């Protein structure tokens, strides 16, 4: 079949640079930054325990509850027990916040509390201060809002107003209450804060409050649980959690577990490898998970991320709330937290606790090796499962805090980093969420590790981070992690993709950031980049060039270092790189290197002139993007030598003269954007301020590549994409059209006189081209490009070429005619441009690319298979443009004074045949050398060759027709014509059909002779016929006379 031929066809001018408009992606407002870091400087521990005396309000049971801070007061005497409990509670708080000033008040007086609060406030005036209260030994707080404390003699409970208490304290502080009616305390505190606010006209949010119970509720009196339940939960969440678990009916699942076993559990709270540390780590992860899942992002950041102590207190507060719910006690927080006892994560917590403690009988008695709990492994597996289908912006996964927790250790660090990188690959929103959760400090600390296996994961993660947010450069410099990236980049064994990512990271680091630029200059980045400058990787070369250009951005030290390393000479090579992106990057780097001369010695002037001359030869570059970068570099050159260019311009109203001529050429560019930029830059010279400097978005455009996902399979490769199905449908239609055309050809050709339609155009039809498969005909006029239909018979679109009046559109071409076709428009001056969305209902005219060529009219012969483009005209040289590389490949000499009137080429062969005005027809073979390209040169006409077409068959016949109207059939393997014919004395235009040997001839007398190669008469249609075209497949003929009338003919 003919499907494989369509499949293996390169799609010219269809890539990221062509489809997507070149520009920088807008940076989102990243609020993930921590606003401030508060510290709990001092801790106040007020213990109104009243050992040995029961408060009159509550008559406790004979057993009652005797455990306060895991100490029995009655065992060691009243004062000794009070002091021991105070010291133990201080130790418990130090377990979470070791660095704090702890001052204990044991049954204090009002004056003592006042003095302590004033002293602590003076110690930390602008920092949070913890005020812990335990009113177990005093009556319940009054509705008026008072707290009972002891007098000097310990004979009467003296009340203490909450208003006075908060008067003594300042704004930044937190409060913890452990009493039966702490809800009353919270309500009174809020009411007094409101009263202060009302008074202020003629400190609520800053204050944080934790309550043991609701105002109506009372503390539990179960003998098994400690009386100091709320504080025990806030201080020893793991111990109280284990004790509470060993009281639930779930112990029936694991018999042989008792409180005695829980007491003798091995391990510490710091050693995570031990069972106790493992439980603590799992509990912290689960509590952070619940907090992030339930609470909103702002409150989550304000509470569980502001400081260590508050985060620990609330992570224990969630467990305290869950435990207290089972005893009809509702802990209360000043910022109202939505209830979290019902969250499913507590089931995972219970499962992990049961699994971990099931091994304790063997650990203590038999003494087995404690196996690590698989909880984190299972959670990471669930995160991976989510990532597998989590392409859509569905609900965020619940395991991001779990990933953050796993990143701390080493047992699962590599897998966690891999999964986090995969998650960040999803898109900018995922990376923003990861920044919100607080992954930045830990991934920053990961740079200190010297493990070489972490280098690819770390560089990928940081590449995504810098792609999303650019402010991390300062933090990277502060950590001195740029050395890590330099080491990664300076490793040839590292794969090219990760080295490209490292280069991108370093380029972002030094992006308009002086400190980073000089840090990397100290880091010998120029030499490292030069070492990996010629690496066989276009993306790597482009990004290394971008980074090198960014390093010397307004930094003379880097410029001098590059001069020592001769970076300019080594970078001249990339100007000829096949990839246009690499050429653009190199031009950007050279322009930036020029822009920071800052009036150095004559060596600087000489090297700058050399760079200018080297950049001057890139005018004949097909890519307008590279030409726009040339314009930016030349603007740098101008701003360096404004006086010289002003003098040169005033001269015309020898280096700067050539640069000014180059700027004139750039101004008269077919691309409107580049022409506008060049014209604006030139006008800035005339009226001679800094505002005239224009920076292209090429840098951020390239940076956007790392924002987009990469790890995923491309849509094109997928078999079931709608795009692939549409392409297959178009291929099937093309195959059917080809088969029908072949069937029509085999049946023969009959007389063609049917006129499908007759319409009038605003302008004279210059050249007409049919779309090979879709029914769209391109009719080019003097100042417009008309697109008609030979089936619907309606006008679709009316374009404007934009060329000057003197110039004229000579030819036309349909690039990628198989599917997603483009329109090639070649003017007679050299302006070649590409049109897209030319005959679509919901899209407007679009210009993909444009570039001046060369510099009869202009002749073009597109070759889709090889992707080569050739333009010819008055110049004695035939240029071979490569659309893949946007550069001329060969410039064969024509060896004739006359202009090239027509040109054609043979598929799968180098049989470039070019007609000439003198009458001679040359043929060139590009396989050999340029001087040997010419093969045959036979001269059998003296007139302008109307059309020197060539048949696509292997036995290609050159049917040359001149103005004399005499037909001669030449062959590439013969020095003389095989058939000679004379049809019309005066011929104006002619067209041939490769499939059907139908030579359509014109005539000044409205005659349209359609003969054969042998000269057999077929049709002489009776109406300056200057435009005829034949359909590539169907035997369709369009004839246009001097009048602006268009017709399409068909064989019945």
């Amino acid at each position: 079949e003919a499907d494989l031929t369509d499949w293996n066809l390169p799609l010219a001018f269809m890539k990221k640079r062509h489809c997507e408009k070149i520009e920088g992606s807008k940076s989102l407002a990243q609020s993930w930054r921590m606003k401030d870091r508060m510290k709990t400087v001092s801790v106040a521990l007020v213990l109104c325990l009243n050992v040995g005396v029961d408060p009159p309000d509550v008559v406790k049971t004979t057993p009652c509850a005797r455990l306060e801070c895991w100490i029995d007061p009655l065992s060691m005497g009243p004062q000794k027990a009070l002091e021991t409990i105070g010291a133990n509670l201080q130790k418990q708080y130090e377990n979470w916040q070791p660095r704090a000033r702890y001052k204990q008040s044991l049954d204090p007086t009002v004056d003592e509390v006042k003095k302590l609060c004033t002293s602590l406030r003076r110690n930390a005036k602008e920092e949070r201060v913890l005020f812990h209260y335990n009113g177990h030994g005093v009556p319940r707080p009054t509705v008026n809002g008072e707290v009972w404390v002891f007098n000097k003699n310990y004979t009467q409970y003296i009340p203490l107003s909450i208003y006075d208490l908060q008067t003594w304290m300042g704004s930044p502080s937190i409060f913890v209450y452990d009493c039966s009616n702490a809800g009353l305390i919270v309500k009174s505190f809020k009411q007094f804060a409101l009263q202060r606010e009302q008074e202020l006209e003629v400190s609520m949010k800053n204050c944080i409050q934790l309550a043991a119970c609701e105002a109506t509720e009372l503390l539990p009196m179960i003998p098994d649980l400690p009386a100091d339940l709320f504080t025990s939960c806030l201080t020893t969440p793991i111990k109280i959690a284990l004790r509470w678990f060993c009281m639930q009916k779930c112990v029936s699942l694991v018999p042989g577990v008792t409180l005695d076993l829980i007491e003798k559990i091995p391990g510490r709270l710091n050693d995570r490898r031990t069972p106790l540390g493992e439980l603590n780590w799992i509990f912290t992860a689960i509590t952070d998970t619940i907090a992030w899942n339930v609470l909103p992002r702002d409150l989550f950041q304000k509470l569980f991320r502001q400081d260590l102590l508050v985060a620990s207190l609330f992570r224990n507060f969630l467990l305290a709330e869950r435990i207290m719910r089972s005893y009809n006690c509702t802990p209360v927080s000043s910022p109202r937290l939505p209830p979290t006892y019902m969250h499913a994560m507590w089931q995972a917590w219970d499962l992990a606790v049961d699994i971990c403690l099931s091994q304790l009988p063997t650990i203590i008695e038999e003494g087995t090796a404690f196996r690590h709990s698989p909880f984190f492994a299972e959670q990471l597996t669930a995160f991976q499962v989510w990532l597998t289908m989590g392409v859509e912006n569905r609900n965020p996964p619940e395991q991001l805090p779990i990933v953050l927790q796993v990143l701390l250790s080493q047992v699962h660090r590599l897998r966690a980093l891999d999964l986090l990188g995969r998650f960040l690959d999803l898109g900018p929103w995922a990376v923003s969420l990861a920044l919100s959760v607080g992954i930045f400090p830990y991934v920053l600390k990961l740079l200190q590790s010297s493990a070489r296996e972490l280098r690819p994961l770390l560089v990928f993660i940081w590449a995504k981070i810098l792609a999303v947010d650019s402010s991390c450069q300062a933090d990277l410099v502060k950590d001195n992690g740029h050395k890590y990236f330099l080491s990664v980049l300076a490793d040839p064994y590292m794969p090219a993709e990760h080295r490209t990512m490292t280069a991108f990271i370093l380029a972002v680091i030094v992006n308009s950031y002086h400190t980073g630029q000089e840090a990397c200059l100290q880091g010998n980045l120029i030499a490292i980049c030069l070492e990996q400058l010629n690496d066989p990787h276009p993306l790597l070369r482009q990004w290394v060039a971008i980074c090198l250009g960014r390093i010397w951005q307004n930094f003379d030290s880097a410029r001098w270092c590059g001069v020592r390393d001769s970076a300019h000479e080594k970078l001249y090579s990339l100007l000829s790189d096949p990839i246009p992106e690499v050429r653009c990057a190199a031009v950007f780097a050279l322009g930036t290197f020029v822009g920071n001369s800052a009036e150095r010695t004559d060596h600087s002037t000489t090297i700058d002139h050399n760079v200018a001359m080297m950049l001057a030869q890139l005018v004949s570059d097909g890519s307008p993007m590279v030409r726009k970068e040339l314009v930016v570099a030349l603007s740098h050159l101008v701003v360096q030598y404004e006086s010289n260019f002003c003098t040169v311009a005033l001269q015309f109203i020898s280096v700067y003269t050539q640069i000014w001529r180059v700027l004139l050429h750039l101004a008269a560019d077919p691309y409107p954007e580049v022409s506008d930029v060049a014209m604006k830059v030139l006008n800035s010279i005339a009226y001679k301020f800094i505002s005239a400097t224009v920076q292209t978005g090429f840098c951020d455009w390239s940076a956007r590549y790392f924002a987009q996902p990469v790890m995923k399979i491309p849509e094109e490769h997928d078999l079931e994409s709608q795009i692939r199905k549409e392409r297959e449908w178009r291929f099937l239609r093309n195959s059917r059209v080809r088969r029908q055309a072949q069937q029509v050809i085999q049946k023969g050709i009959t007389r063609l006189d049917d006129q499908i339609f007759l319409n009038r155009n605003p302008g004279v039809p210059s050249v007409v081209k049919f779309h090979p498969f879709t029914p769209c005909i391109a009719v080019a006029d003097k100042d417009s490009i008309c697109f008609w239909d030979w089936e619907k018979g309606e006008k679709l679109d009316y374009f404007h070429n934009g060329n000057p009046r003197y110039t004229r559109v000579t030819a036309m071409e349909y690039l990628n005619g198989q599917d997603c076709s483009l329109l090639l428009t070649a003017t007679d001056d050299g302006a070649i441009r590409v049109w897209k969305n030319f005959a679509d209902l919901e899209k407007n005219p679009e210009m993909v690319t444009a570039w001046q060529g060369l510099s009869a009219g202009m002749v073009v012969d597109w070759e889709q298979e090889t992707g080569l483009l050739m333009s010819s005209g008055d110049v004695r040289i035939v240029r071979i443009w490569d659309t893949d590389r946007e550069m001329k490949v060969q410039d064969i000499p024509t060896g004739a004074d006359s202009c090239v009137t027509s040109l054609s080429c043979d598929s799968h062969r180098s049989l470039i045949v070019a007609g000439l005005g003198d009458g001679s027809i040359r043929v060139y073979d590009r396989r050999m050398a340029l001087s040997e390209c010419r093969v045959m040169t036979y001269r059998e006409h003296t007139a302008w060759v109307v059309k020197a077409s060539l048949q696509k068959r292997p036995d290609g016949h050159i049917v040359s027709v001149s103005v004399n109207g005499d037909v001669r059939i030449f062959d590439p393997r013969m020095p003389e014509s095989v058939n000679v014919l004379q049809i019309v004395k005066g011929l104006t235009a002619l067209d041939i059909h490769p499939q059907a040997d139908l030579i359509a001839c014109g005539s000044v007398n409205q005659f349209t002779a359609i003969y054969n190669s042998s000269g057999e008469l077929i049709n002489n249609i009776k109406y300056a016929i200057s435009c005829l075209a034949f359909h590539p497949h169907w035997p369709h003929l369009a004839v246009g006379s001097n009048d602006y009338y268009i017709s399409v003919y068909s064989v019945e």
């Binding site: 260590l308 830990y442 600390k445 200190q448």
Partner: peptide
């Protein structure tokens, strides 16, 4: 910081 990170070299 907020969480203790071990085994970092």
């Amino acid at each position: 910081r907020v969480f203790f990170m071990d085994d970092v070299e």
